[PDB]
From a paper:
The apelin receptor belongs to the G protein-coupled receptor (GPCR) superfamily, comprising nearly 800 transmembrane proteins that provide targets for over a third of all FDA-approved medicines. The receptor binds two endogenous peptide ligands, apelin and Elabela/Toddler (ELA), proteolytically cleaved from preproproteins to yield smaller, active fragments such as [Pyr1]apelin-13 and ELA-11. Dysregulation of apelin receptor signalling can, therefore, contribute to a range of disease states, and there is much interest in the apelin receptor as a therapeutic target in cardiovascular, metabolic, immune, renal, and neurological conditions.
To further understand the potential implications of the orthosteric variants for small molecule agonist binding, we determined the crystal structure of the apelin receptor in complex with CMF-019. The structure was determined by molecular replacement using the previous apelin receptor crystal structure in complex with AMG305431 as a search model and refined against a dataset including reflections up to ~2.6 Å resolution. Our structure showed that the elongated CMF-019 molecule binds in a semi-vertical pose extending from the upper part of the large orthosteric pocket, where it lies at the interface between TM6, TM7, TM4, and ECL2, reaching the bottom of the orthosteric pocket at the interface between TM6, TM7, TM2, and TM3. As a relatively hydrophobic compound (Chrom logD 3.14), CMF-019 makes mostly Van der Waals contacts with the receptor. The binding pocket is also lined by several polar residues from TM3, TM4, ECL2, and TM5, notably including the tyrosine residues Y185ECL2 and Y2646.51 that form hydrogen-bonds with the CMF-019 carboxylic group in the extracellular vestibule (ECV) and core amine, respectively. Whilst it corresponds to the monoolein molecule observed in the previously reported AMG3054 and cmpd644 apelin receptor crystal structures, in our structure it protrudes somewhat deeper towards the agonist, and lines the CMF-019 binding site between sub-pocket II and the ECV. Its carboxylic head group stacks onto the CMF-019 aromatic core and forms a salt bridge with R1684.64, which makes a direct contact with an outer edge of the CMF-019 central aromatic ring.
Numbering used by the authors: 29 to 55, 62 to 134, 140 to 228, 1001 to 1048, 1053 to 1106, 235 to 324
Write the structure that this text describes.
């Protein structure tokens, strides 16, 4: 009685939200993944009224064996396709941070592959799903029959075999790829920011310093950070007109640090602090804006943020489903008490709601991070 309501709520939110996303993308490099996610999320929730009616009828499937096989199959392919599309979107956001449109062709290929690979991994569910009176309650259930692939003493090896494969490909491998993407990109972004943090932190140190040696020490660390940010090539590729302007901006800053460094060496603390404060002028403020703009700093921070929200929304939504399926896999295999077997069984339909929550949450995360979808939806509003 509780679960059917949630299944209905996610059905409306899922098809209206992801329906609005497809309307927009059909009215960039990572835009293949967006439209694939919209159509995977859309097929994922589309047969839920069948399972909402099934759960309401105290687990009694009235729609026959073909709708039991087809409904489960469409859900299971959407299940993998949307995970693989989230992982492909997280990998495309990773490349937009490291590398500098051939990706428009490549993304289409990647999406095509994961769409076939998903429709093939979901094939065992299309095969073993069947309807019959399981555990004799007089109501027919839509269950996965492992008896058509093994004897009584072997149904576990199939249940575990397919179950472990489902979690490995549907959770462990994509989360391992999305975490690797985060760890590499976060490192790269935290390289540019480290040099700019060092510059600002040490300027505060010069302002409050009490002697020339303290001012000299902070200037030395600022000078090494300025040259460190000059060596890191921005997202532009020899001695081109635009390339010289980047290095000249840094040369002004390094020169001003050297000017204060020579005053510090002569023991002129007040004059060195005043010389250091030249970096705060409007002239040097636009040099900072030009150089931080040339590096694509705020634009790469937004890109890293996109990865984190994908990784986390996914880890939070799918962990309960994958933890309880893996725990139940072991409860039946290495036998656990019926107190714990029956717990995992009854908490499992709640795990499918929190996992479904990912599908209808996505249209809002696109609306958050992409102001082009915000402007495409607000024009139609
Ligand atoms: C296709 C139907 C949907 C439900 C709408 N469904 C999904 C995909 C999703 C739909 C919505 C969110 S996830 N996965 C499922 C996994 C099982 C399952 O493994 N049951 C185990 C016994 C067995 O092996 O048959 C026992 C539990 C206690 C572990 C059952 C239904 C599953
Ligand atoms: C098993 C499947 C798990 C891995 C799934 C997807 C990884 C996709 C990474 C490649 C995306 C290509 C992006 C691009 O080149 O534009
Ligand atoms: C050519 C066929 C492809 C080979 C498949 C190998 C990978 C199998 C992995 C997942 C298949 C789905 C298994 C689902 C686990 C049981 C969940 C359920 O009760 O529906």
């Amino acid at each position: 009685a509780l679960i059917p309501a949630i299944y209905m709520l996610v059905f409306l939110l899922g098809t209206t939200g992801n329906g609005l996303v497809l309307w927009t993308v059909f009215r960039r490099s990572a835009d293949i993944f967006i439209a694939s996610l919209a159509v995977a999320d859309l097929t994922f929730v589309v047969t839920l009224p069948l399972w909402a009616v099934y759960t309401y009828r105290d687990y009694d499937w009235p729609f026959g064996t073909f709708f039991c096989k087809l409904s489960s199959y469409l859900i299971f392919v959407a299940m993998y396709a949307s995970v693989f599309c989230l992982t492909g979107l997280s990998f495309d956001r990773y490349l937009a941070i490291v590398r500098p449109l051939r990706l428009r062709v490549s993304g289409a290929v990647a999406t095509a592959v994961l769409w076939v690979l998903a429709a093939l991994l979901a094939m065992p569910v299309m095969v073993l799903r069947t309807t019959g009176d399981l555990e004799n309650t007089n109501k027919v259930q839509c269950y996965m029959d492992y008896s058509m692939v093994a004897t009584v003493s072997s149904e576990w090896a199939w249940e575990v075999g397919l179950g472990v494969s489902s979690t490995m490909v549907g959770f462990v491998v994509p989360l391992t790829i999305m975490l690797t993407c985060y760890f590499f990109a976060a490192q790269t972004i935290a390289d540019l920011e480290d040099n700019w943090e060092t510059l600002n932190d040490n300027l505060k140190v010069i302002e409050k310093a009490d002697n020339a040696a303290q001012v000299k020490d902070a200037l030395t660390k600022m000078r090494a950070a300025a040259l460190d940010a000059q060596k890191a090539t921005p997202p532009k590729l020899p001695d081109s007109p635009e390339m010289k302007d980047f290095r000249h901006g840094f040369d002004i800053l390094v020169g001003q640090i050297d000017d204060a460094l020579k005053l510090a060496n002569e023991g002129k603390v007040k004059e060195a602090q005043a010389a250091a404060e030249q970096l705060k002028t409007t002239r040097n403020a636009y040099i900072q804006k030009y150089l931080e703009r040339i590096e694509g700093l705020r634009k790469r921070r937004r890109l890293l943020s996109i990865i984190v929200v994908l990784v986390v929304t996914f880890a939070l939504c799918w962990m309960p489903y994958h933890l309880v399926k893996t725990l139940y896999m072991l409860g039946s295999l290495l036998h656990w008490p019926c107190d714990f077997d029956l717990f995992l069984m009854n908490i499992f339909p709640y795990c499918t709601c929190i996992a479904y929550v990912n599908s209808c949450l996505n249209p809002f995360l696109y609306a958050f991070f992409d102001p082009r979808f915000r402007q495409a939806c607000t024009s139609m509003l």
